[PDB]
Design a protein around this ligand. Structure first.
Ligand SMILES: [Mg+2]
Length: 225
C-alpha cells in the first residue's frame, strides 16, 4: 500500500472517546472503597496502596477519588487502575470497544504501532480484551498479536512535541515519508508533520467537531486505507 508503517492514536481514533469516562473511570471508582477498606498488609494491591503515603483509610479513599475527579496524572493511581482494570478485563466485566473497521485495519496492515497518553502496559491490556463487534457480550478478542509496538509519554515524550515523533521514528526504523499517523487531535498531527510524517485526521461519532476551514485529510473510517 501507500505506506510501509502506520502509527495510531487510541482515543477518538480506534476507540470511542466515551469509553474512559462512561466505562473505565466509573468501573474503577466503584471498586475503590472495597479495596481500600479491606486492609491486609501483605497483598500485591497493598504495596500499590502504601505508595500514596496516606495511612487513614477514609483519607486514602477520598484522595484516590479526588485524583480521578480532578484527572490527576499520578503514577501510583495508574498502577492501581491497571490492577483493577486487569481483573475487570480478565473477569469479562469490561471490554474495549474498538471500531470494527479499526480491528480489520490492524489485522491487515503489516506494520502497526500505537502512540497514546495511556502507558504501554495499559495499551497492551486494552488490546488484549477487545469487544467482538459480531457479539459484544461474547468473549473478547486479542489484537496484541497484530500490533508491532506501543509508545507512551514516558517512552517518547509529549504528543504535541515534534521531538517525540523523532524518538518514535528512531525506534520504528522507518523513513518519515513511509509513515502515516492517524489521530483526532490536530495538534498531534502538526507535531508529527514537523519531522515529515504523513498525517490523517480521524473523525468518529462523539469527537469534537471538525472546523470547515482545516488543512488535514479527514478519515471517518479506515476501510479505504
Ligand atoms: Mg485521541
Amino acid at each position: 500500500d501507500n505506506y510501509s508503517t502506520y502509527l495510531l492514536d487510541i482515543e477518538g481514533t480506534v476507540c470511542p472517546i466515551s469509553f474512559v469516562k462512561e466505562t473505565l473511570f466509573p468501573y474503577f471508582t466503584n471498586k475503590v472503597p472495597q479495596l481500600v477498606q479491606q486492609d491486609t498488609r501483605d497483598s500485591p494491591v497493598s504495596n500499590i496502596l502504601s505508595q500514596f503515603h496516606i495511612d487513614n483509610k477514609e483519607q486514602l479513599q477520598a484522595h484516590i477519588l479526588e485524583l480521578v475527579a480532578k484527572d490527576v496524572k499520578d503514577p501510583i493511581l495508574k498502577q492501581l487502575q491497571g490492577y483493577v482494570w486487569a481483573h475487570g478485563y480478565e473477569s469479562g466485566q469490561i471490554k474495549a470497544p474498538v471500531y470494527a473497521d479499526a480491528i480489520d485495519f490492524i489485522k491487515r496492515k503489516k506494520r502497526v504501532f500505537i502512540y497514546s497518553s495511556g502507558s504501554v502496559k495499559a495499551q497492551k491490556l486494552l488490546f488484549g480484551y477487545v469487544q467482538d463487534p459480531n457479539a459484544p457480550a461474547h468473549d473478547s478478542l486479542d489484537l496484541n498479536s497484530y500490533i508491532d509496538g506501543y509508545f507512551d509519554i514516558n517512552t517518547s515524550g509529549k504528543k504535541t512535541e515534534t521531538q517525540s515523533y523523532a524518538n518514535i521514528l528512531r525506534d520504528i526504523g522507518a523513513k518519515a515519508s513511509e509513515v502515516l499517523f492517524l489521530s483526532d487531535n490536530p495538534l498531534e498531527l502538526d507535531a508529527a508533520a514537523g519531522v515529515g510524517i504523513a498525517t490523517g485526521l480521524a473523525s468518529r461519532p462523539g469527537n469534537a467537531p471538525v472546523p470547515d476551514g482545516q488543512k488535514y485529510q479527514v478519515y471517518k473510517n479506515f476501510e479505504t486505507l
